[PDB]
Amino acid sequence: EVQLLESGGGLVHPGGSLRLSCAASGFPFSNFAMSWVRQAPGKGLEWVSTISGSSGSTYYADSVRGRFTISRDYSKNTVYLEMNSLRADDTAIYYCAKDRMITFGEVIVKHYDAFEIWGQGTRVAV
C-alpha cells in the first residue's frame, strides 16, 4: 500500500520550536512531492508547505514563510516540517499528504498537483 505516519505531536509554549516528522512508505519517495496541510479546530483546512521530490523546490504558504522549514531525509524516507517561533494560531492538527503527480529530474515542471494520499495527522497545541 501507501502509508504515511506523521508524529511530531507536542504542546509547546509560544515562541517555542517543534519538528514534525512524516515517515512515508509504499511508493517511490523521490518521485513524489510531499506537502503539509493544516486544519485548526472547527475551521477549514489550510495548506502549509510542499517540497519537490528532489527537494530542489520548497513552497511555503504566505503566513508560514520564514518560520517553518520543510525538508526530506532520503535515508529514512521521512519528510520533516520543523517550525520555530510558533504563535497561537499555529494550533491545529497537521496532515502529511503525498502528491498525485509523479515527477522525475529530467523535466522542469511544477511539482504540485493534488493531494492523493493523506495521513491521520498529529496535534500541535501552543
Partner 1 sequence: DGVGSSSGNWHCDSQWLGDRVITTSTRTWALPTYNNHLYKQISNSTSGGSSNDNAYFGYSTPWGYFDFNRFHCHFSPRDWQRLINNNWGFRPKRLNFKLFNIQVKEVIANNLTSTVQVFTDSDYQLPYVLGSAHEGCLPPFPADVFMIPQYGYLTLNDGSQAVGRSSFYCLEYFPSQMLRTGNNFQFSYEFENVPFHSSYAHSQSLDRLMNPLIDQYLYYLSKTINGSGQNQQTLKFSVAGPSNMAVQGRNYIPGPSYRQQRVSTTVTQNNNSEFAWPGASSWALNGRNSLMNPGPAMASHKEGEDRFFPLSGSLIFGKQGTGRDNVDADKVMITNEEEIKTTNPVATESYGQVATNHQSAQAQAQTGWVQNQGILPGMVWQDRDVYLQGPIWAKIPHTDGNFHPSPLMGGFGMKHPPPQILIKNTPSFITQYSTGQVSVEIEWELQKENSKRWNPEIQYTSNYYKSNNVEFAVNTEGVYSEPRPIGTRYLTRNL
Partner 2 sequence: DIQMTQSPSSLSASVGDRVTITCRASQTISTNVNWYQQKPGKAPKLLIYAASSLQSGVPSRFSGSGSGTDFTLTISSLQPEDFATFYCQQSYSAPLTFGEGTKV
Residue 90's φ and ψ, nearest 5 degrees, are -70, -5
CB nearer to partner 1: pick between 49 and 126: 49
Question: What whole-number distance in Å separates Cα of residue 97 and Cα of residue 117?
Answer: 5
If one asks whether residue 100 binds partner 2 (CB under 8 A), the answer comes out as: yes
CB nearer to partner 1: pick between 56 and 66: 56
Are the C-beta atoms of 80 and 87 separated by less than 8 Å? no
Grid cell in block for residue 12: 509547546
Question: What whole-number distance in Å separates Cα of residue 89 and Cα of residue 48?
Answer: 13
**Other beta carbons less than 10 A from residue 115's beta carbon:** 20
Q: Using CB under 8 A, which of 10, 47, 69, 71 touches partner 2?
A: 47
Query: What residues numbered 6-35 form the site for partner 1, per CB under 8 A?
Result: 25-31
Are the C-beta atoms of 65 and 3 separated by less than 8 Å? no
Query: What residues numbered 107-126 form the site for partner 2, per CB under 8 A?
Result: 110, 112-116, 118-121
Query: What residues numbered 84-103 form the site for partner 1, per CB under 8 A?
Result: 102
The residues that touch partner 1, with contacts defined as CB under 8 A, are 1, 3, 25-31, 52, 54-57, 59, 73-75, 102, 104-111
The residues that touch partner 2, with contacts defined as CB under 8 A, are 37, 39, 44-47, 50, 59-62, 95, 100, 110, 112-116, 118-121
